[PDB]
Amino acid sequence: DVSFRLSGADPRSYGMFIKDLRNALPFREKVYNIPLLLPSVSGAGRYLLMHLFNYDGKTITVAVDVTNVYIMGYLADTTSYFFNEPAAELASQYVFRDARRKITLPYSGNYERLQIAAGKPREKIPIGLPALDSAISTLLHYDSTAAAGALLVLIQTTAEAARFKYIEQQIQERAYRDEVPSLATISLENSWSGLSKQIQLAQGNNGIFRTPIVLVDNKGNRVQITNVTSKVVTSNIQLLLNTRNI
Numbered sequence: 001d002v003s004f005r006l007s008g009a010d011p012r013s014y015g016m017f018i019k020d021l022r023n024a025l026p027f028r029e030k031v032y033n034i035p036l037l038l039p040s041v042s043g044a045g046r047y048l049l050m051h052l053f054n055y056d057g058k059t060i061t062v063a064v065d066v067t068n069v070y071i072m073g074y075l076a077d078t079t080s081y082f083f084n085e086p087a088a089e090l091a092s093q094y095v096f097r098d099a100r101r102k103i104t105l106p107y108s109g110n111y112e113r114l115q116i117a118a119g120k121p122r123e124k125i126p127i128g129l130p131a132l133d134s135a136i137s138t139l140l141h142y143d144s145t146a147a148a149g150a151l152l153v154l155i156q157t158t159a160e161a162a163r164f165k166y167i168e169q170q171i172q173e174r175a176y177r178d179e180v181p182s183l184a185t186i187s188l189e190n191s192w193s194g195l196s197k198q199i200q201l202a203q204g205n206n207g208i209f210r211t212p213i214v215l216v217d218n219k220g221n222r223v224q225i226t227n228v229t230s231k232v233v234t235s236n237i238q239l240l241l242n243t244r245n246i
């Protein structure tokens with residue numbers, strides 16, 4: 001289980017929470033020195049539980065699928081809430097079985113459906129650690145419109161920060177002030193499967209990508225990633241989505 005408490009949270013303890021989250025995800029192989037996540041894990045062993053405590057010390061417990069870092073649902077007080085999709089429903093068989101009631105959220109867990117329900121695209125939703133604090137507080141008292149925007153903050157400050165060191169950095173910069181994500185953060189979020197597939201395919205091709213991935217960089221310009229020598233590969237991506245699961 002990993003745990004983060006926002007009271008006392010500073011860029012450094014956050015950096016540490018994100019290092020422990022990565023560290024808690026099982027892998028048997030490293031492809032180009034990046035952890036390759038497992039193709040499947042069975043049952044209960046498929047879910048990591050994160051305890052998040054907001055500044056006032058209230059907690060929600062989020063269940064994450066360890067094969068692809070997907071947030072499946074969460075428990076607030078005595079109620080579990082799960083995304084409306086098959087994988088979240090399978091997850092309910094193993095986690096939060098102690099909750100007095102189980103509520104299925106009107107939407108599934110991907111960004112398209114969540115932005116529709118929340119009302120804004122995520123490039124207009126400020127993220128940071130004050131926004132994570134706010135998100136926890138929202139999720140404690142059900143409201144499904146408000147839960148959609150809070151869950152967009154929650155995904156980006158935990159699962160997306162574990163996947164890319166750049167997003168973790170970005171959230172460390174927003175430790176005392178929220179700010180909308182750069183377009184580089186949106187691009188990276190959207191490319192994880194692609195990037196993961198081509199680094200794994202690069203293995204039998206001299207570290208060269210069979211199809212290059214285009215990203216927006218820091219300075220907002222289009223940039224083609226073509227082999228594993230790239231800074232995106234050497235420094236930025238931290239966990240690889242197994243090809244079996246793409």
Ligand SMILES: Nc1ncnc2[nH]cnc12
Nearest residue numbers: 069070071109110111159
């Ligand atoms: N529900 C989710 N959990 C983690 N990463 C995601 N990316 C998009 N939706 C996500």
